[PDB]
Motif scaffolding. Structure first.
Motif, PDB file in Angstrom:
ATOM      1  N   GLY F   1      22.145 -40.714 -18.780  1.00  0.00           N
ATOM      2  CA  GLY F   1      22.197 -41.731 -17.692  1.00  0.00           C
ATOM      3  C   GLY F   1      21.852 -41.042 -16.394  1.00  0.00           C
ATOM      4  N   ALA F   2      21.910 -41.758 -15.276  1.00  0.00           N
ATOM      5  CA  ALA F   2      21.603 -41.165 -13.983  1.00  0.00           C
ATOM      6  C   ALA F   2      22.617 -40.061 -13.743  1.00  0.00           C
ATOM      7  N   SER F   3      22.143 -38.932 -13.249  1.00  0.00           N
ATOM      8  CA  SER F   3      23.027 -37.826 -12.954  1.00  0.00           C
ATOM      9  C   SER F   3      23.912 -38.341 -11.818  1.00  0.00           C
ATOM     10  N   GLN F   4      25.065 -37.711 -11.611  1.00  0.00           N
ATOM     11  CA  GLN F   4      25.964 -38.129 -10.541  1.00  0.00           C
ATOM     12  C   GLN F   4      25.242 -38.032  -9.205  1.00  0.00           C
ATOM     13  N   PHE F   5      24.496 -36.949  -9.030  1.00  0.00           N
ATOM     14  CA  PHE F   5      23.752 -36.715  -7.797  1.00  0.00           C
ATOM     15  C   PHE F   5      22.851 -37.888  -7.489  1.00  0.00           C
ATOM     16  N   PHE F   6      22.173 -38.383  -8.513  1.00  0.00           N
ATOM     17  CA  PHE F   6      21.260 -39.498  -8.328  1.00  0.00           C
ATOM     18  C   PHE F   6      21.980 -40.806  -8.010  1.00  0.00           C
ATOM     19  N   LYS F   7      23.086 -41.069  -8.705  1.00  0.00           N
ATOM     20  CA  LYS F   7      23.833 -42.297  -8.478  1.00  0.00           C
ATOM     21  C   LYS F   7      24.346 -42.294  -7.070  1.00  0.00           C
ATOM     22  N   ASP F   8      25.129 -41.280  -6.749  1.00  0.00           N
ATOM     23  CA  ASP F   8      25.695 -41.165  -5.419  1.00  0.00           C
ATOM     24  C   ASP F   8      24.629 -41.281  -4.330  1.00  0.00           C
ATOM     25  N   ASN F   9      23.454 -40.701  -4.564  1.00  0.00           N
ATOM     26  CA  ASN F   9      22.349 -40.752  -3.597  1.00  0.00           C
ATOM     27  C   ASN F   9      21.834 -42.167  -3.403  1.00  0.00           C
ATOM     28  N   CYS F  10      21.671 -42.883  -4.516  1.00  0.00           N
ATOM     29  CA  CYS F  10      21.169 -44.257  -4.499  1.00  0.00           C
ATOM     30  C   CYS F  10      22.183 -45.230  -3.933  1.00  0.00           C
ATOM     31  N   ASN F  11      23.442 -45.052  -4.324  1.00  0.00           N
ATOM     32  CA  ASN F  11      24.541 -45.895  -3.848  1.00  0.00           C
ATOM     33  C   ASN F  11      24.823 -45.703  -2.343  1.00  0.00           C
ATOM     34  N   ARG F  12      24.202 -44.681  -1.755  1.00  0.00           N
ATOM     35  CA  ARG F  12      24.332 -44.376  -0.333  1.00  0.00           C
ATOM     36  C   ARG F  12      23.351 -45.272   0.449  1.00  0.00           C
ATOM     37  N   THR F  13      22.324 -45.771  -0.248  1.00  0.00           N
ATOM     38  CA  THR F  13      21.288 -46.625   0.342  1.00  0.00           C
ATOM     39  C   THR F  13      21.458 -48.109  -0.026  1.00  0.00           C
ATOM     40  N   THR F  14      20.520 -48.918   0.470  1.00  0.00           N
ATOM     41  CA  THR F  14      20.473 -50.369   0.238  1.00  0.00           C
ATOM     42  C   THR F  14      19.744 -50.773  -1.056  1.00  0.00           C
ATOM     43  N   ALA F  15      19.177 -49.787  -1.740  1.00  0.00           N
ATOM     44  CA  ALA F  15      18.470 -50.030  -2.975  1.00  0.00           C
ATOM     45  C   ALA F  15      19.482 -50.215  -4.111  1.00  0.00           C
ATOM     46  N   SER F  16      18.966 -50.368  -5.320  1.00  0.00           N
ATOM     47  CA  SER F  16      19.812 -50.530  -6.478  1.00  0.00           C
ATOM     48  C   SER F  16      19.412 -49.529  -7.554  1.00  0.00           C
ATOM     49  N   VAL F  18      18.786 -48.318 -11.285  1.00  0.00           N
ATOM     50  CA  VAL F  18      18.320 -48.913 -12.538  1.00  0.00           C
ATOM     51  C   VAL F  18      18.261 -47.747 -13.518  1.00  0.00           C
ATOM     52  N   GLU F  19      19.173 -47.727 -14.481  1.00  0.00           N
ATOM     53  CA  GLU F  19      19.250 -46.637 -15.450  1.00  0.00           C
ATOM     54  C   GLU F  19      18.617 -46.829 -16.828  1.00  0.00           C
ATOM     55  N   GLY F  20      18.167 -45.715 -17.395  1.00  0.00           N
ATOM     56  CA  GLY F  20      17.576 -45.702 -18.715  1.00  0.00           C
ATOM     57  C   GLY F  20      16.450 -46.671 -18.981  1.00  0.00           C
ATOM     58  N   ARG F  77      12.798 -41.612 -20.818  1.00  0.00           N
ATOM     59  CA  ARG F  77      13.326 -42.627 -19.916  1.00  0.00           C
ATOM     60  C   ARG F  77      13.466 -42.158 -18.471  1.00  0.00           C
ATOM     61  N   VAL F  78      13.574 -43.116 -17.555  1.00  0.00           N
ATOM     62  CA  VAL F  78      13.709 -42.830 -16.142  1.00  0.00           C
ATOM     63  C   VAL F  78      14.783 -43.691 -15.509  1.00  0.00           C
ATOM     64  N   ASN F  79      15.410 -43.164 -14.471  1.00  0.00           N
ATOM     65  CA  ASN F  79      16.426 -43.886 -13.746  1.00  0.00           C
ATOM     66  C   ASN F  79      15.764 -44.147 -12.419  1.00  0.00           C
ATOM     67  N   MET F  80      16.048 -45.280 -11.795  1.00  0.00           N
ATOM     68  CA  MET F  80      15.400 -45.585 -10.532  1.00  0.00           C
ATOM     69  C   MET F  80      16.334 -46.070  -9.471  1.00  0.00           C
ATOM     70  N   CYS F  81      15.860 -45.981  -8.243  1.00  0.00           N
ATOM     71  CA  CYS F  81      16.593 -46.459  -7.089  1.00  0.00           C
ATOM     72  C   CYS F  81      15.495 -47.259  -6.406  1.00  0.00           C
ATOM     73  N   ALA F  82      15.506 -48.576  -6.609  1.00  0.00           N
ATOM     74  CA  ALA F  82      14.470 -49.441  -6.053  1.00  0.00           C
ATOM     75  C   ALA F  82      14.954 -50.496  -5.078  1.00  0.00           C
ATOM     76  N   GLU F  95      14.042 -40.509 -11.287  1.00  0.00           N
ATOM     77  CA  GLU F  95      14.539 -39.337 -11.963  1.00  0.00           C
ATOM     78  C   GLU F  95      14.064 -39.355 -13.394  1.00  0.00           C
ATOM     79  N   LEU F  96      13.262 -38.371 -13.778  1.00  0.00           N
ATOM     80  CA  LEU F  96      12.795 -38.277 -15.148  1.00  0.00           C
ATOM     81  C   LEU F  96      13.892 -37.635 -15.976  1.00  0.00           C
ATOM     82  N   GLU F  97      14.366 -38.315 -17.005  1.00  0.00           N
ATOM     83  CA  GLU F  97      15.387 -37.706 -17.831  1.00  0.00           C
ATOM     84  C   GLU F  97      14.855 -37.355 -19.215  1.00  0.00           C
TER      85      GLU F  97
END
Lengths: 36, 186, 98, 98, 98, 98, 98
Positions: F1-16, F18-20, F77-82, F95-97
């Protein structure tokens, strides 16, 4: 050709194709990695 | 999916061979070829290793089963290895391709055409004295980017190369008749 | 592990030598706060790849991104010389190993 | 072995011809003291990859990096024409052999 | 072998067509005497790739270099339209064939 | 899934986040009105990849494209912050996983 | 077959949608007459890839060349949107299918 020979022959072609498939896929991932 | 093969060849031998090659090939995987490839003959072939005669290398569907096969054909060896293999189209479902003619259906064999290249080997377990010694040793040459999401070859592709002998019943029956090589049809 | 050359060069610096790392995630981010390229190890370690606008460091940093991409895709390991000054730690040197 | 062509161009210079080398590490380093691009052979030999900012050499050195990296990624051997002046030796020409 | 389109274009110019070529070595040379990018075939042929600083040709020559490398890495054959004006002959057009 | 770093980074912004996601299509469109780069997932979803002219975002976007294509070519798979502020949604971080 | 998204985009234009093509040749031509980048399908059909010096199309057209090269090496299928105007037909949008 005999049934045997044609089987072997068809089988060798299938193998050769698989091997080429792997080489080209590897090549593709490599060019994607090394290119700017 | 992962397939498993109990083999008496050490990881070093495999590395030198470029993979798990069939019994009739003397050169590294990418260099040579089996002198004769025939799925039917291979599935019937009985020495010092698990089935790998006639251009194919035998693999099975579980660790437990590869292990059982190990204790059975490789019992007598103080040590052997069970290789974990990623799914790819060089693997053919023997029971599915040969139908009711599958000689050892209990083995759930997935025949690897021409062998298994090193990059397809995910890792291996060492079996010492019939016991799996420790965990799986990850193969550093495994290339995940090349095998992610591939699957075994569809049965249709195997019917054409089933290899039953000339005039064998199968060549006059569906599905094989519809894919038989010319010189095999009655 | 790291070549003797790589180990020695890193030891001559204030950065830490991280050996045999398995990268599994490659991140590209343009969000105003976390604007940069990052890599994640199989253990959850996170590093920022360095960037340089000018020659010759732009050549080196471009190669670091190529190395990170190659490592994540193929599963080949890397040895890094990372500066703990920032968090995540910045990469000052990276060695792709076969 | 190195193409006859390669053997000849290198022997026309001050550099030495190193053949059938197996590259195992590819290094990008921006630490000011060791700033550069390097490759390490399976036997521990280390070389520096040339660089150039202006045309046409900026193209040849870029390919030199790709050839070096494709060699580490694939395990294919290379033949080099490297100058002994500097240390690590500098690669003036490189031949990727299939 | 060469596609009709490729065949036609070359036979329109003064260059020679070469087909089903197996490239086995890729070379980057900055030694001023032999400064350039070259390819060697399985039969011993040597050709040099064309370079071009300005657009649109800078794009074509770059693509030309990718094709040559793809060929040496994969084993895929190429067809070339090379000018016999120089020695080695320069490649004016190249076709990669699956 | 999205690494913690990626989640926390995305959740800091207005985007959403999108995992796996599995990318199955890669589009390059110069038609003047749909001009852009898009990816389509196995689930039919469409996203546009950000572009940028200036440093340093021109580097992050270039890697974004390289990540998108590598996902398409390998099934990784990829996780996104869109940003859901547009249709198609725009990718601000990927994030390429492996 | 092409995505609904790709289909509807090509619809609003002059170009003709071409689904499920298999590219088998990649060509780089710098000869006066034929200066350009081309691709050839299994059926013998030929297309020309768009090029642009200006931004952001220089980005899109470069992604087209990458998509073409990938298809030719992977045997993966593409769907184009080509303008019937010029000869060979010019690709204005391309879609790589996994």
């Amino acid at each position: 050709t005999t049934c045997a020979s044609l089987t072997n022959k068809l089988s060798q072609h299938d193998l050769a194709d698989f091997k080429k498939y792997i080489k080209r896929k590897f090549t593709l991932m490599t060019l994607l990695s090394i290119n700017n | 999916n992962d397939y498993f093969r109990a083999d008496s060849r050490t990881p070093d031998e495999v590395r030198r061979s470029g993979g798990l090659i069939p019994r009739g090939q003397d050169e590294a995987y990418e260099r040579g070829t089996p002198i004769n490839i025939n799925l039917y003959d291979h599935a019937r072939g009985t020495t010092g290793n698990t089935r790998y005669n006639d251009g194919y290398v035998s693999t099975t569907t579980t660790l437990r089963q590869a292990h059982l096969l190990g204790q059975n054909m490789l019992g007598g060896y103080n040590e052997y290895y069970i290789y974990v293999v990623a799914a790819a189209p060089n693997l053919f479902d023997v029971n599915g391709v040969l139908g009711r003619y599958s000689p050892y259906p209990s083995e759930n064999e997935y025949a690897a055409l021409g062998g298994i290249p090193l990059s397809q080997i995910i890792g291996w377990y060492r079996v010492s004295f019939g016991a799996i010694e420790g965990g799986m040793h990850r193969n550093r040459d495994y290339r995940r980017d090349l095998f992610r999401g591939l699957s075994a070859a569809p049965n249709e592709d195997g019917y054409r190369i089933a290899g039953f002998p000339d005039g064998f019943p199968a060549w006059e029956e569906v599905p094989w008749r519809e894919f038989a090589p010319n010189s095999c049809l009655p | 592990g790291a070549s003797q050359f790589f180990k020695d060069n890193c030891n001559r610096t204030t950065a830490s030598l991280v050996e045999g790392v398995e990268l599994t995630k490659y991140i590209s981010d343009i969000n105003n706060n976390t604007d940069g390229m990052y890599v994640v190890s199989s253990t959850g370690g996170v590093w920022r790849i360095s960037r340089a606008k000018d020659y010759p460091d732009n050549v080196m940093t471009a190669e670091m991104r190529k190395i990170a991409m190659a490592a994540v895709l193929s599963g080949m390991r890397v040895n890094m010389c990372a500066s703990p000054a920032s968090s995540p730690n910045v990469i000052w040197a990276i060695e792709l190993e076969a």
